[PDB]
Structure formats: structure tokens, C-alpha cells
Swiss-Prot record, chain B:
PROSITE patterns with a match to the protein in the record: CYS_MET_METAB_PP (PS00868)
Key word Metal-binding present: no
EC number(s) on file: 4.4.1.11, 4.4.1.2
Function: Catalyzes the alpha,gamma-elimination of L-methionine to produce methanethiol, 2-oxobutanoate and ammonia. Is involved in L-methionine catabolism. In fact, shows a multicatalytic function since it also catalyzes gamma-replacement of L-methionine with thiol compounds, alpha,gamma-elimination and gamma-replacement reactions of L-homocysteine and its S-substituted derivatives, O-substituted-L-homoserines and DL-selenomethionine, and, to a lesser extent, alpha,beta-elimination and beta-replacement reactions of L-cysteine, S-methyl-L-cysteine, and O-acetyl-L-serine.
Organism: Pseudomonas putida
Result after altering residue 238 to D/E: Marked decrease in elimination activity against both L-methionine and DL-homocysteine
Activity regulation statement: Irreversibly inactivated by DL-propargylglycine.
Catalytic function, reaction form: L-methionine + H2O = methanethiol + 2-oxobutanoate + NH4(+); L-homocysteine + H2O = 2-oxobutanoate + hydrogen sulfide + NH4(+) + H(+)
Biotechnology usage: The recombinant MGL protein cloned form P.putida has been found to have antitumor efficacy in vitro and in vivo. PEGylated MGL is being developed as a cancer drug.
Sites where the protein binds substrate: 112, 373
Name of the protein described by the UniProt record: L-methionine gamma-lyase
Description of how the protein assembles with itself and partners: Homotetramer; dimer of active dimers.
Amino acid sequence: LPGFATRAIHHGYDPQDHGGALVPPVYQTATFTFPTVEYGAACFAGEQAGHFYSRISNPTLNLLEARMASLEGGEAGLALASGMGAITSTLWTLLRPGDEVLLGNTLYGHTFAFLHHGIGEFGVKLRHVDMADLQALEAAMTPATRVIYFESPANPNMHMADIAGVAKIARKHGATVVVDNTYCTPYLQRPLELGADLVVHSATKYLSGHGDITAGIVVGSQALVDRIRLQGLKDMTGAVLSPHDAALLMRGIKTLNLRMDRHCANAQVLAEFLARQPQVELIHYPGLASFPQYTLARQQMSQPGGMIAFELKGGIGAGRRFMNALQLFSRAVSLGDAESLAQHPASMTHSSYTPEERAHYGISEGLVRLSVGLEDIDDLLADVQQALKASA
Amino acid sequence: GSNKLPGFATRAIHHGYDPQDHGGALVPPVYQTATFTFPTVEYGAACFAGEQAGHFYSRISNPTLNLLEARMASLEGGEAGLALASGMGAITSTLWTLLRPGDEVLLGNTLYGHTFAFLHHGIGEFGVKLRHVDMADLQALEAAMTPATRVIYFESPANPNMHMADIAGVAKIARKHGATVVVDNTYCTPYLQRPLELGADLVVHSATKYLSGHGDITAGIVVGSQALVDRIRLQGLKDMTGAVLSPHDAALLMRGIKTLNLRMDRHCANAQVLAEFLARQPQVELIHYPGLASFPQYTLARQQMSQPGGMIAFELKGGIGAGRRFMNALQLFSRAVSLGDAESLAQHPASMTHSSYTPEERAHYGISEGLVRLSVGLEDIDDLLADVQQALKASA
Ligand SMILES: N[C@@H](CCS)C(=O)O
Ligand SMILES: N[C@@H](CCS)C(=O)O
């Protein structure tokens, strides 16, 4: 069993099989041909485990899937046009009218919109529960419960979930547990190893690393991934990942270990710094001693990650002033790029709302979120420091 | 004077782009970027509130895609466009946005297989009622409308029989009962047929086929009113499918569109010469091509398509086994699903797509044991003729 860096570079590919090419060639093709109608016939039931149309089985995409499956330690992988691609295809195939999905207390905005305004409107029952509270979770189960879905750590406050805890509970009811592992990557956390059934990824973020691609991943067990490929992707979503973008995702995956180390090192520093700031009410970073779920965090993540959330003392106004003053962080939604990013939802995403609605969603008035990039930590410090000056 | 619409080719190469707004770049740069940033936190406050113009995240809107979208809209004759990861991405994003439990969809009698799967085993398992109807029969369609009918959805010409519908007839009926008409316009492209100009509310495309023209990308387009395209963009795509089109692929789609009028003229000139030849060969029992008077809906084709297309279907004498022997003798056509490539493609559903079924359930689906489908490409006609004639001789 080769190491993670090795596998992330080499897994699933032998140059000697493809003309000696160091880097595998990109199958930017829509369709595939057949030597005979017989060899055609085989590929519409599926006996010679291989290549089928490119909206089902392109080699380039297969290489990506196998590598990601290796990295998350799962049976099988599926690549998709976007992270929503991955989550919609999974849920559309796993759920039907009357089934229930249990959801983590908070969710990526578009996931929430999919659940409450998408499948939810098609007769699927939604319940939100705190997924670190195993008793609340147990009590929430009903015969109807078929899926339990959550992120860990979860936007907005890095609130973790006890993956193995929930998974014990799901076994008692044959429920499928699905974990959005976008924030951690298989490099920092492997939820399948902790007993989840499927993981989903917005590969758009850390896995790509360079913010030039939109892509999605699903990893899990061959049977589940099979159904999602042939039902979710093929029939319900059509979220097909382009071969060019697959290749670039692979190119990005080759540095995962190296980039995530830096992202973390950079975040650790920025966070001990913020933790001492008198403009700072409160801070959420898994790697501080003050992080309420510190122990659970260290149990599931091998490093505390590249994301920080803090609340500024002066609410919306401070938030605004802080955001405007940054010259190195860019005001943008998104995360996991080489570039450092910030957002202040109160005055950005959730601006149109009001204080009382933002409290409902746990979006504090002065809540800012940092995606710490790979720039030099002294440059990142100077920027955060001056931006704090302006926030007075 | 200057209130005249530019020609189709002109709009295909230029619409929506002036080099002078991107520093003289003759070809638009490609926005291969996932995210966009904001100068002020206020500037971006408005981009989540309808006040200002710009882009937030390439899953919702992007300048490479926007141009592609605007060009397609101009070609189709519609208000707005939307570009997605595939034909199915376009179709599913649209129906997921437009339908809810208790709504009914009227469907054409036959469809593309994944569209059929999506409908029967996907959206239909979610509380949406389905009914099929001969769209060529306006009397039957009128009869089928009920106050639950929300959409009428069909392809014209349809897979795989090229059955056609009267678009303007359907729209007329739909305007009377109040349903949204969506037409899958893949086979024609906007160069041969414009359903929106005929009264349809939305067209969808597998741009993967003719629009791309070069079989290297998978991509979907939807075109219609600003108010429905936005709904679809903001609900279907953003929330329910995530069928995001890659800007690299959209740049290639745009590159392919630049020669559409030329590719199409040649697909059609080729198929016409092929069809006429096939109609006259001993091994050919039957032939379906819209440019032939023997085509059952000859009159609707002439009326609705400016040209008869690159698809031919034809039945062989000798039974499945002639088919096999034909398909396998081919040296220039390739054995393959798909259409609208530069390369000529053939398929023999009997010994291929529908090969697991026994000779019974194939005759049950209108599908002969001698049926073969041709997507005629852009090769030299004699070469194509020569290959097919050598191949008929083999299936003797
Ligand atoms: N995940 C980021 C951006 C994706 S659109 C966010 O939370 O806004
Ligand atoms: N539309 C073509 C190819 C897509 S798989 C077909 O009818 O099979």
C-alpha cells in the first residue's frame, strides 16, 4: 500500500500501457466506436469492465474516479460537472416521495436550496438535526429515514459531526450516510474509513486548488456508485464532467498533500493571531484549544484545515469596513484556491435578509469567513492587520 | 438600411462580441475561472439582489458561457440562452424547474432513450404524470389536454423514426389551454428549424451533436423567454442538476458554431445523395429520409425544415444478419451511437442498442430486424457511396 502522495500522483496509471506517455492523454471525445456489432452488443449490458459512450465511461474520467476512490479509501468513484452535480445526482437516486433525509443543522447554501426548494417540493421529507448529538439523532429516526446527510466541518461555524457515532445509528436502520468532505479532502479526513457509505466533493475547491475548474466527486461502494452513475447522472442530472477539466483536476490533485499542508500552516498562524484580537468577539478554528469540539476534531482530521470563521465586535458595519479594506484577500465566495478569499455574508450573500433571519441560520451580524490561501504568511498577516484597523 | 438583421452566418461568427471591448482579441478570451471577485462589499451586495450586473460563480453565470448563450439565442430567435454540461443537463434542468407533483406532461410518442428514462424512471417516480400522444395528430392532442397539463414536450424530428410534429399546431393548442411547449431541436439545429419562431416556448439542444459538429465535447443548450430561461438557470441548473458547462468546452462549441451553415449544407447534400441511392438498391426494403417523397410526413418536413437533415433510416432485406453483415462490412462509416459528427456513423439497433431483447420485443417497439440508422457526415460522397454499396453486397 503506497503512500498518499504516491497514490495521488501515480495511482491507476502505467505509462507503458499508453505509448510511454508520462502524463495520460486526454480523451476529449463524445463518442466511441466498435470493431464489430458484437463488441457493440456487449457494451449495452456490460461484461468487459471498460469504456461506454463518455456520458457513461471515458478513460480520462475513469482514471480520475479510480484515483479519487484510492485516495478516499473506497470501492468506486464518479466524476461530475460540479459539486451540486455530485450531491443532486446522489440524492435524486437515493430518495423517493415519502422517504426522509436527516440533515445537519447547517448546510452549504445551494444544498439547502436544493433540499427545501427542489426534492423537498417533490414529496421528500426534510428534517434538520444536530449531528454531534447522538441522542437527538437517534430520537429523530423514523421508518421513513433513508438518508442522513451533512458536512463536517460544517459551514458556518466549523461545527463538526461524530461520523462514526451517526454511522452506528444508521446501521440500526439500514440508512445511508452521505458526507460532504469538501472542506477536509481525503487528505485530512476519510469519512468512509469512519463508516460513512458515500462521500461527496465539490472538487471545484481544494481538490482542484487553483480555482479554474468546476467539478464534483462521489466516492463509495460499487453498488451505490453504480446506481448514481446510471440513474442520477445519466437520467436525472446530466452533470457531465468534461475530459479537459478532469485532466486539470488530476493535475491539481498531484499537489494536494503539499497545498493542504500550506493552507493549514497558514491558517494556524492567522488563527492564533485573530484569537488575540480585541476587535474579535469570537473565533471558530478547529485548531485552537478553545474550539468546542477540539477533541472530536483531532479524532477525525489529521490537520485542522484552511478555513477560519470569526465574529467582529462591531457587527455589519465593521464587517463592511474590514472587507473593503483588504488588498490581498479578494472579496469572493468560494474557497480552497491558491488565492486567499474572504466573505462577510451579512453584507454579501445574505445581505438582502435582516438581522432576525440571519440569526435563524446562525449567521451572526459580524461573521466573516476566511479561505486561507498559499501566499506568504507575512503578506497575509499585514493585510488582516490593516483591515482590522479600518474595522474600527 | 441598418435595422436589417445580419445574416445567419454573420451572427454565428460575430453576434454578441466586439474585439474592441477585450483589447482587440479577435477571438474572445476564455474565462476558465471558477470564481469572480468584488471591488467593494456593496458592489457584490447587489449581485445577490438584482440591482447590479456581473457574475458571482461560474455555476450560475460566466462571460464565455454568456456569449455562447447570447449567440444561440440570436440563432434560435429567442430572448435568452443557457448553456449546460449536456443535452440531458438541458432537458432535466428544464423539466425539474417547470414541473411539480400533480402536474402532467404531454409527451411525443417516441423519444431519446435517456429522455424516456428520465421521464418514466426519474421525474415520473416523483409525482408528475406522464402521457404519450401522437404529436402529429392535433385532434388527438387537443383531446389529451386536461387542466393539469403544464408542459408539452417533444422532439421534431424525433428519435429514432424521425416522426414529426406540427410545431405551430401544438403551440396554437397550447396557447388555448395554457401549457408551456418545449421542443428538442437537436436534429435540425437552428439553421434548419426554429421552433420558437413557430410558437414553442423553449427549445433544448444536445449541442454535443451538430452544434459542436466535431464530436469532441458534450454540451446542452436551452433557449427561450428571458423569464423562463432565468427560472431554469436559477432553479434547474443552480439547485437541481449542477450540469455546469466548462468554459473550455463552451469555447469549442462556439468554434463549431462558426461553421454551422457550411457543415449543415454538406450533411444535407450528402444524405440526399445517399438516400436517393439507397432507395434504388435491391437490398433496401424501406427508406426514411425527409427529402424523399416516400417519407410519410414529406409535407411537414418541407413546411418546417429548410432542409431535410443528415439522418437516414432504412430497412434491409435479409433480416438481422443482413444488418450484422452490412454493419460489419463498413470501412468508412464507424459503428457507433451518435450523430452530427464530421465522421459518418451507422448503428443497427437489433444487433446493438437493443441487442439484449429477443426478435419479439424489437418488432414491439417499431424497430425492424433490418433497421439501420445513418448519421451521414462530411466525407467525400463517392467515398460514402462506395463504402455503403460494398457493404450492401456483403449483407446479400
Ligand atoms: N462554498 C462557497 C462558495 C461556493 S458557490 C460559499 O460558501 O459561498
Ligand atoms: N442521439 C444519438 C446518440 C446519443 S447516445 C442516439 O439517438 O443514440
